[PDB]
Amino acid sequence: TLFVALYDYEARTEDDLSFHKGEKFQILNSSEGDWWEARSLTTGETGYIPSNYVAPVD
Ligand code: NA
């Protein structure tokens, strides 16, 4: 399942990932917690994203 960003997000450190509303991601790990390691389908960049900022694609 692919996820889409609901809002813009600016990373605070090297470990999280900045993104724009509407950006899509593949999810790598989702069972450490509510922050998921993800890969942008736009840039190929990877990093942690807050799961409350994304929703599963239609
Ligand atoms: Na979500």
Curated annotation (Swiss-Prot):
Occurrences of domain SH3 (ranges): 1-58
Locations listed in the record: Cytoplasm; Nucleus; Cell membrane; Perikaryon
Transmembrane feature ranges: none
Tissue: Isoform 1 is highly expressed in the brain. Isoform 2 is expressed in cells of hemopoietic lineages, especially T-lymphocytes.
Post-translational modification: Phosphorylated at tyrosine residues, which can be enhanced by NTN1.
Function of the molecule: Non-receptor tyrosine-protein kinase that plays a role in many biological processes including regulation of cell growth and survival, cell adhesion, integrin-mediated signaling, cytoskeletal remodeling, cell motility, immune response and axon guidance. Inactive FYN is phosphorylated on its C-terminal tail within the catalytic domain. Following activation by PKA, the protein subsequently associates with PTK2/FAK1, allowing PTK2/FAK1 phosphorylation, activation and targeting to focal adhesions.
Oligomer and partners: Interacts (via its SH3 domain) with PIK3R1 and PRMT8. Interacts with FYB1, PAG1, and SH2D1A. Interacts with CD79A (tyrosine-phosphorylated form); the interaction increases FYN activity. Interacts (via SH2 domain) with CSF1R (tyrosine phosphorylated). Interacts with TOM1L1 (phosphorylated form). Interacts with KDR (tyrosine phosphorylated). Interacts (via SH3 domain) with KLHL2 (via N-terminus). Interacts with SH2D1A and SLAMF1. Interacts with ITCH; the interaction phosphorylates ITCH and negatively regulates its activity. Interacts with FASLG. Interacts with RUNX3. Interacts with KIT. (Microbial infection) Interacts (via its SH3 domain) with hepatitis E virus/HEV protein ORF3.
Family in the record: Belongs to the protein kinase superfamily. Tyr protein kinase family. SRC subfamily.
The name this protein goes by in its record: Tyrosine-protein kinase Fyn
